[PDB]
């Protein structure tokens, strides 16, 4: 039945047009997830390896980045700025893990030199760390979104030939 065959053949064409759309939305979903988790894992890795930091806001990094996005340069820097001022000061003995940042970032006062403002030093650091993290996250999102789209449009295509 020639017109039967042309009906299925126009059906397979609509399936294939839908499949393409399916395979991109499935790819992007997977890229988003891979991206916003390589970012978290890269920023944590950087704080822990280069800066020996394993907590912020008095939570472990794991929990912290669940509630504030690893790209939120403003609030990351503000968190550090605040934790530095209220845990490396005079008025408590609480948690002095983070205080090393002042040595690292060059804030310790040197008689004979100009003043390095704390918050500007932190936002330079956090901008560098977040840019790094966003770039590796983007590569993860690029790979994973491509790998899923390819597999989906392949799998669906072969399905649309049975």
């Amino acid at each position: 039945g020639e017109i039967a065959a042309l009906a299925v053949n126009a059906w397979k064409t609509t399936a294939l047009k839908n499949a393409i759309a399916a395979a991109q939305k499935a790819g992007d979903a997977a890229g988003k997830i891979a991206g916003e988790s390589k970012g978290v894992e890269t920023i944590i890795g950087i704080l822990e390896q280069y800066y020996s930091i394993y907590e912020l806001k008095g939570t472990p990094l794991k929990s912290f980045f669940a509630t504030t996005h690893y790209t939120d340069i403003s609030n990351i820097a503000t968190v550090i700025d605040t934790e530095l001022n209220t845990s490396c000061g005079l008025n408590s003995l609480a948690n002095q893990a983070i205080c090393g940042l002042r040595t690292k970032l060059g804030l310790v006062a040197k008689p004979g030199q100009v003043m390095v403002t704390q918050k500007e030093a932190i936002t330079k650091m956090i901008t560098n760390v977040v840019h790094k993290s966003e770039i590796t996250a983007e590569a993860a999102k690029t790979e994973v979104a491509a790998t899923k789209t390819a597999a989906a449009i392949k799998m669906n295509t072969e399905a649309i030939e049975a």
Binding site: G89, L90, N91, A109, P111, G112, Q113
Partner: protein
């Protein structure tokens, strides 16, 4: 060019555990920021809350509300008058009494 700051304590350097102490940094007029440093020089506190005692002087206070033996140790002043940090004060050794 910049005179060394001076440091003093109120009520003194030997503090009953749990009670308070205030350090005073004194320096020339026109100071911007007073910094009270501890021996570990990542621990320190800044303040712009400057006052004057005399026309050619300025000063700032640092209160510790509840002293513990981890507060005990050396304390120093240094101040910032643009574009220059001064040199450091003599040390003041804070001690904690049991009772």
């Amino acid at each position: 060019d910049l005179p060394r700051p001076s440091i003093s304590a109120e009520p003194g350097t030997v503090i009953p555990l749990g009670s308070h102490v205030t350090f005073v940094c004194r320096g020339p007029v026109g100071v911007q920021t007073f910094r009270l440093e501890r021996e570990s020089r990542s621990l320190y506190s800044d303040t712009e809350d400057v006052s004057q005692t005399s026309p050619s002087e300025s000063e700032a206070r640092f209160r510790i509300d509840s002293v513990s033996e981890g507060n005990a140790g050396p304390y120093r002043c240094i101040y910032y008058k643009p574009p220059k940090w001064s040199e450091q004060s003599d040390y003041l050794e804070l001690l904690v009494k049991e009772a």
